[PDB]
Design a protein around this ligand. Structure first.
Ligand SMILES: Nc1ncnc2c1ncn2[C@@H]1O[C@H](COP(=O)(O)OP(=O)(O)O)[C@@H](O)[C@H]1O
Ligand SMILES: CC1=C(C(=O)c2ccccc2)[C@@H](c2cccc(O)c2)NC(=S)N1C
Ligand SMILES: [Cl-]
Ligand SMILES: [K+]
Ligand SMILES: [Mg+2]
Length: 334
């Protein structure tokens, strides 16, 4: 008892701009063999390709529901059992980190947020939480906070009584040693499924007001969306089980090459896989906050997003090489 960090790769399909220009892919996926092959240069007539094996692989045709049913539901269940799980998204801007985590809405109001097929991890997860706990006989309370880092300043994106210019501050919990205390960050209680949306949307709004202030805010900022569940399960025979589960959904700043947290994460990951005594957790806010998610007592997953365009070959390969090194990181949950 321990468990490796599981890494999945998700290629995005071509957009219309790429299709109208008869875009040809330099990427291939074999979910069955769990491999991703990349045409590192040359022709489809004859070429050289680089292959990588990950814990899971999802090609361009993969829909949100697929990702949720495969990687998220199983991790949500662990969370409901009373554990800590963290999921990430890593990749160059434009590859789908935000689609994956939050997703979007189908045009012309064709749908309600609960059935929108374009929904990503965050909302589908908040919807199931109520769907699975209200079902059985469990007393629970759910909580959410959306913390984001920009050039090492922390921003609270869900306090509708504050503005965002205000940075919050970080301190170490004298209680837990692999933890920090973020003074003032608000924790919004989601009383029921029909409250989930406005809460998200509000964060959407505060965010667009963050984009006006900070340059490239959506590309250079790290987003940590946390949902905390307090459950008091009473079995049918009548036993009381008091659990506390926490899930962190992190949308990292684009990997494309200033960002102290991005650089540190890579250095922390290097130390962990190279079994180096000192792990530079403290050299960045992101890594101190999420210290337990990297060689800690939390179940971690990294979803690496990539592009199929030949224009992004170089960045696509850095992302794979990076994600592939992560696989060797060891975590001990209980
Ligand atoms: N898996 C996908 N399926 C359909 N569209 C996608 C997918 N991944 C990315 N896209 C599209 O690509 C663009 C890149 O989106 P985004 O999620 O914002 O990327 P990033 O956060 O990595 O910068 C969006 O317009 C989005 O709709
Ligand atoms: C607000 C919001 C989302 C979020 O998860 C989110 C964004 C910013 C901060 C916190 C959460 C997500 C979404 C939500 C519900 C249904 C859906 O289909 C897509 N994507 C969009 S477009 N919206 C409207
Ligand atoms: Cl769906
Ligand atoms: K896909
Ligand atoms: Mg984004």
């Amino acid at each position: 008892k321990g468990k490796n960090i599981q890494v999945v790769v998700r290629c995005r399909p071509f957009n219309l701009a790429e299709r109208k220009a008869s875009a040809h892919s330099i990427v291939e996926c074999d979910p069955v063999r769990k491999e991703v092959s990349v045409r590192t240069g040359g022709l489809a007539d004859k070429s050289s390709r680089k292959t990588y094996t990950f814990d899971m692989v999802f090609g361009a045709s993969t829909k949100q529901i697929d990702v949720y049913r495969s990687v998220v539901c199983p991790i949500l269940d662990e969370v409901i059992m009373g554990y800590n799980c963290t999921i990430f998204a890593y990749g160059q801007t434009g590859t789908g980190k935000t689609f994956t985590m939050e997703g979007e809405r189908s045009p012309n109001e064709e749908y309600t947020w609960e059935e929108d097929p374009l929904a990503g991890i965050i909302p589908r997860t908040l919807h199931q939480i109520f769907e699975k706990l209200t079902d059985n006989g469990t007393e629970f309370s759910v909580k959410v906070s959306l913390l984001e880092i920009y050039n090492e300043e922390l921003f609270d994106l869900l306090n509708p009584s504050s503005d965002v210019s205000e940075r919050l501050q970080m301190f170490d919990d004298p209680r837990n040693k692999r933890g920090v205390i973020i003074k003032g960050l608000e924790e919004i209680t989601v009383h029921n499924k029909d409250e989930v949306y406005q809460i998200l949307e509000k964060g959407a709004a505060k965010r667009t007001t963050a984009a006006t202030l900070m340059n490239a805010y959506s590309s250079r900022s790290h987003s940590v969306f946390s949902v905390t569940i307090h459950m008091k399960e009473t079995t049918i025979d009548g036993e009381e089980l008091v659990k506390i589960g926490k899930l962190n959904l992190v949308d990292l700043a684009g990997s494309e090459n200033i960002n102290q947290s991005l650089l540190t994460l890579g250095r922390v990951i290097t130390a962990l896989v190279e079994r180096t005594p000192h792990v530079p957790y403290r050299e960045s806010k992101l890594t101190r906050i999420l210290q337990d998610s990297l060689g800690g007592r939390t179940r971690t997953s990294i979803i690496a997003t990539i592009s199929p365009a030949s224009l992004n070959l170089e960045e696509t390969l850095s992302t794979l090489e990076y994600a592939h090194r992560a696989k060797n990181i060891l975590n001990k949950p209980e």
